[PDB]
Design an enzyme around this catalytic site. Structure first.
Site, short mmCIF file in Angstrom:
data_model
loop_
_atom_site.label_atom_id
_atom_site.label_comp_id
_atom_site.label_asym_id
_atom_site.label_seq_id
_atom_site.Cartn_x
_atom_site.Cartn_y
_atom_site.Cartn_z
CB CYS A 1 -0.52 2.18 3.80
SG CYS A 1 -2.19 1.78 3.35
CB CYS B 1 -0.96 0.00 1.20
SG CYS B 1 -2.11 1.40 1.34
#
Ligand code: CU
Length: 107
Positions: free
Chosen positions: A35, A32
């Protein structure tokens, strides 16, 4: 990363659901991008808010079961627990200013 609690599906009830005061749980994964973009921002908030709340992350690759019990649809997603109950959530990447805006509103 020293100020951030490592959560697992099994450790979750104890570390979050049973904690007193406020916890900011970051749902995330190594695949991600967005993220990882907010990981440094999160470390600074563990710092600046060290006396107000705990910051925690849970990796969804290695812990598939906790997120669905919250209706989380893809990551990053931030949940703010107060004494083991969700007070607010923030989906999508955000900036430092947007994250403390989010916190300063529920603390
Ligand atoms: Cu650290």
């Amino acid at each position: 990363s020293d100020k951030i609690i490592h959560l697992t599906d099994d450790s979750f009830d104890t570390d979050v659901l049973k904690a007193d005061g406020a916890i900011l749980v970051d749902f995330w994964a190594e695949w991600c991008g967005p993220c990882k973009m907010i990981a440094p921002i999160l470390d600074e908030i563990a710092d600046e808010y060290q006396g107000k709340l705990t910051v925690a992350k849970l990796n969804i690759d290695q812990n598939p079961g906790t997120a669905p019990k919250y209706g989380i649809r893809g990551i990053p997603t931030l949940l703010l627990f107060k004494n083991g109950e969700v007070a607010a959530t923030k989906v999508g990447a955000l900036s430092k200013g947007q994250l403390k805006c989010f916190l300063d509103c529920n603390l």
